[PDB]
Amino acid sequence: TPYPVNCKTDRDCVMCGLGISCKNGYCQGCT
Incomplete structure (x- = not known):
């Protein structure tokens, strides 16, 4: 889930x- 997935x-x-x-x-929404 794109909850704890940070990025730039x-x-x-x-x-x-x-x-x-x-x-x-x-994160917005990966796979």
Whole structure:
């Protein structure tokens, strides 16, 4: 889930999935 998945860019949330939209320093919705 994109709850505790932080990031700056799209591929920064790679931990969540393959290309995740990054919100205010977090994950929007990976796979």
